[PDB]
Amino acid sequence: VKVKFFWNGEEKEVDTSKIVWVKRAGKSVLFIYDDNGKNGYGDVTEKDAPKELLDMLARAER
Amino acid sequence: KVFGRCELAAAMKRHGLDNYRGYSLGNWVCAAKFESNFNTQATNRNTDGSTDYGILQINSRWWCNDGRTPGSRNLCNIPCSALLSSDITASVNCAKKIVSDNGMNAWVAWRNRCKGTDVQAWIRGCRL
């Protein structure tokens, strides 16, 4: 599944299979992904988040 | 300050990183090696406009304020310059927040160079 989000004004898409770290911040979900062997960053609102990403956050939150 | 390997190990142990969130001391040492080469003053711009700071290369988007990163959350409530000190306290405390919501997967150097390896090798020979 893709996570569609804007980052530096510009439209990004990241596969959830590349996400390695997830955190809730208010009404947003922060995530780090493997970007061809470097860290990439993003965020999306919890209401816009694909359920696959919400699943990752739920697993992290125990 | 450029720490020696065992010098850093001892400092990280005193700061409570050994087994912090289940990560044994060598994980932290190994991550510092590959993030910063043990140099507290290391800084590196990310292509997205953020910058990474200090011995653990902590990023300015979420953790610290550098004054020039859009959308800064400053979750560690510190200037990024605090992460460059010879005293590792600010970096350790910020690292603990990063891992307390998860793990060391936040660090590219840890994923790429440390995970799955004999990380206790990084603390062998050290007086701890």
Numbering used by the authors:
A (entry chain C): 2 to 63
B (entry chain B): 1 to 101, 103 to 129
Publication text:
As an important step towards this goal, we have exploited the plasticity and stability of artificial 7 kDa affinity proteins (Affitins) derived from extremophilic proteins, such as DNA-binding protein 7d (Sac7d), which are found in various Archaea such as Sulfolobus, Acidianus, and Metallospharea genera.
With the aim of comparing potentially different modes of binding, we also included Affitin H4, which was selected against HEWL from the L1 library, and does not display obvious sequence similarity with anti-CelD Affitins. The structure of Affitin H4 in complex with HEWL showed an unusual mechanism of inhibition. A total buried surface area of 1750 Å2 resulted from this interaction, to which Affitin H4 contributed 839 Å2. This binding interface is larger than Affitins with the extended loop. There were seven residues from Affitin H4 involved in H-bonds, including the non-randomized Val23 and Gly38. Residues Lys39 and Asp44 formed two salt-bridges, which sealed the catalytic site by anchoring at the β5-strand ends of Affitin H4. The non-randomized Lys39 formed a salt-bridge with residue Asp52, which acts as a nucleophile to generate a glycosyl enzyme intermediate that is critical for HEWL activity. Affitin H4 showed an enthalpy-driven reaction with a higher favorable binding enthalpy and unfavorable binding entropy, consistent with Affitins that bind through mutagenesis on the same surface.
